[PDB]
Amino acid sequence: GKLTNGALEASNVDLSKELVNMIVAQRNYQSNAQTIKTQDQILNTLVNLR
Amino acid sequence: YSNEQEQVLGQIVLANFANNEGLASQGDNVWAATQASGVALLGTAGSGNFGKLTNGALEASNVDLSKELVNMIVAQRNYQSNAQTIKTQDQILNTLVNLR
Amino acid sequence: GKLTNGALEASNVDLSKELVNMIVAQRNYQSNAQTIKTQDQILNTLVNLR
Amino acid sequence: SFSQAVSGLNAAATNLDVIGNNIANSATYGFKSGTASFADMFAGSKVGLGVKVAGITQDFTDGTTTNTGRGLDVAISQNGFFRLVDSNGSVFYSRNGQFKLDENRNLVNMQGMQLTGYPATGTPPTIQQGANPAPITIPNTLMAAKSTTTA
Amino acid sequence: SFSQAVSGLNAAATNLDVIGNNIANSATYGFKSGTASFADMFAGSKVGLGVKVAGITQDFTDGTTTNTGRGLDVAISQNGFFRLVDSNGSVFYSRNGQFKL
Amino acid sequence: SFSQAVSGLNAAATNLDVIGNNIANSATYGFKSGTASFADMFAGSKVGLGV
Numbered sequence: 001g002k003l004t005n006g007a008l009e010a011s012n013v014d015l016s017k018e019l020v021n022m023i024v025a026q027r028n029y030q031s032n033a034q035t036i037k038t039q040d041q042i043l044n045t046l047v048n049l050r
Numbered sequence: 051y052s053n054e055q056e057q058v059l060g061q062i063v064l065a066n067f068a069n070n071e072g073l074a075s076q077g078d079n080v081w082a083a084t085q086a087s088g089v090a091l092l093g094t095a096g097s098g099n100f101g102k103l104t105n106g107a108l109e110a111s112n113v114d115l116s117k118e119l120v121n122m123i124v125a126q127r128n129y130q131s132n133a134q135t136i137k138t139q140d141q142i143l144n145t146l147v148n149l150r
Numbered sequence: 151g152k153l154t155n156g157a158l159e160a161s162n163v164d165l166s167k168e169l170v171n172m173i174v175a176q177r178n179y180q181s182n183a184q185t186i187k188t189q190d191q192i193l194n195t196l197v198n199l200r
Numbered sequence: 201s202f203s204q205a206v207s208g209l210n211a212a213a214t215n216l217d218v219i220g221n222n223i224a225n226s227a228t229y230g231f232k233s234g235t236a237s238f239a240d241m242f243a244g245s246k247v248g249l250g251v252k253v254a255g256i257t258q259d260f261t262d263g264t265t266t267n268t269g270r271g272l273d274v275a276i277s278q279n280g281f282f283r284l285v286d287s288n289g290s291v292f293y294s295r296n297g298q299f300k301l302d303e304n305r306n307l308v309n310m311q312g313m314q315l316t317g318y319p320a321t322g323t324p325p326t327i328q329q330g331a332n333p334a335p336i337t338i339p340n341t342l343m344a345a346k347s348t349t350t351a
Numbered sequence: 352s353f354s355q356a357v358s359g360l361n362a363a364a365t366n367l368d369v370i371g372n373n374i375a376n377s378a379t380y381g382f383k384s385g386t387a388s389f390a391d392m393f394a395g396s397k398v399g400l401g402v403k404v405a406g407i408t409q410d411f412t413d414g415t416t417t418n419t420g421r422g423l424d425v426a427i428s429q430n431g432f433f434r435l436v437d438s439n440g441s442v443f444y445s446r447n448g449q450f451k452l
Numbered sequence: 453s454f455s456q457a458v459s460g461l462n463a464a465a466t467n468l469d470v471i472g473n474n475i476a477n478s479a480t481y482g483f484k485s486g487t488a489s490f491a492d493m494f495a496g497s498k499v500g501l502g503v
Contacts, residue, residue: 262495263501264459264494264501
């Protein structure tokens with residue numbers, strides 16, 4: 001490509017889409033957390049029903 | 051390229067199975083052909099029953115969390131019901147053993 | 151119908167009514183969620199009262 | 201007769217983990233949701249014995265398309281799998297639309313498996329549809345000049 | 352069988368931080384957005400075991416050009432990296448258009 | 453099912469910037485106004501997927 005002076009490239013990160021990504025990811029994250037809790041609760045149940 | 055043209059480099063081949071549905075899950079997101087799947091049929095995008103290959107996109111998982119969380123909660127209750135069934139039998143057996 | 155040039159049809163979606171639909175639907179959604187929780191709580195109650 | 205409860209218990213455990221994987225892998229690409237069937241066990245009695253066995257399945261519905269633009273992000277609609285070849289000479293199938301050119305001028309996933317297709321031949325190249333699904337490569341070498349033949 | 356949830360949990364954590372770095376480093380120069388692929392783990396069962404592993408990638412799309420004028424602010428379009436050499440005799444590549452004497 | 457909203461959100465963002473460039477570059481010479489078409493995404497459902 002060309003090497004024009006008078007300019008810097010600057011990051012190609014788009015915050016209007018990254019914030020969205022983040023929020024969605026957080027929900028996904030929590031879904032995983034419940035999966036673990038679910039299993040934990042269950043195991044505890046089993047252990048104590050005996 | 052610089053010679054003012056487009057040339058063919060190759061053609062991506064697409065595969066359909068008899069059953070698609072029946073494939074053996076592997077690796078990362080890889081499937082092995084199986085007898086259940088039958089033998090793959092090869093073709094090109096837009097031909098026969100082979101879908102299109104638009105660029106500019108990834109398919110992404112078809113999992114719907116709004117329904118999976120529900121499934122999970124219900125399943126947990128079901129699970130516990132089974133647990134009580136066992137406990138019930140255990141308690142009973144212990145009862146029997148000790149009533150003598 | 152007629153085929154006048156000089157124009158595109160554009161979507162027939164009315165945002166002044168869709169936003170309303172959405173808000174109402176959300177409340178309805180939550181009502182269903184409580185129904186499930188209700189049943190879950192109850193079942194858990196039953197299981198543990200023994 | 202604990203088996204008539206234990207069987208079920210185990211089946212339920214399996215179910216939960218299948219769900220767990222759907223949830224976790226919901227952030228993956230091309231992943232198709234998994235599930236499982238269940239069936240009644242053993243006869244020789246009016247009462248089912250053992251009780252339950254599980255059969256896991258996977259439902260290949262289409263996903264979405266996701267407004268991407270880097271690499272060779274090729275999505276696929278409806279049925280169809282990309283035909284991949286493992287470096288050890290093994291054929292695999294995948295809907296993993298993420299493709300990139302490696303240092304050998306080969307199209308691969310990540311994974312790392314080779315994307316195959318029909319070979320091109322002639323000048324300009326033509327697609328041998330009747331040929332075997334050769335590995336797709338993209339040379340960075342020069343188009344030779346071609347004399348005028350007609351005008 | 353906690354691993355079938357934990358794996359995913361960890362993958363999600365990684366994803367979040369990748370996003371976090373894109374956000375933070377959005378104010379940097381020549382920075383290319385990062386992301387990650389994910390893949391299904393272990394067979395030996397109809398049910399995936401372990402479940403998920405992550406593979407980080409970086410998408411080198413062009414940025415913008417930014418009306419600067421001090422130093423040797425050389426931007427670059429399309430592909431291309433500036434070839435840099437570390438004082439210890441090591442070769443590196445960069446799109447860092449900021450140069451000074 | 454966030455994709456059915458996110459897709460649209462992104463499309464809207466693009467639209468805004470296209471407009472933004474028309475406005476900014478209104479002071480340029482020979483510049484022709486830009487715009488964009490939009491289309492419905494993915495089937496396999498009665499409900500549009502992706503969008």
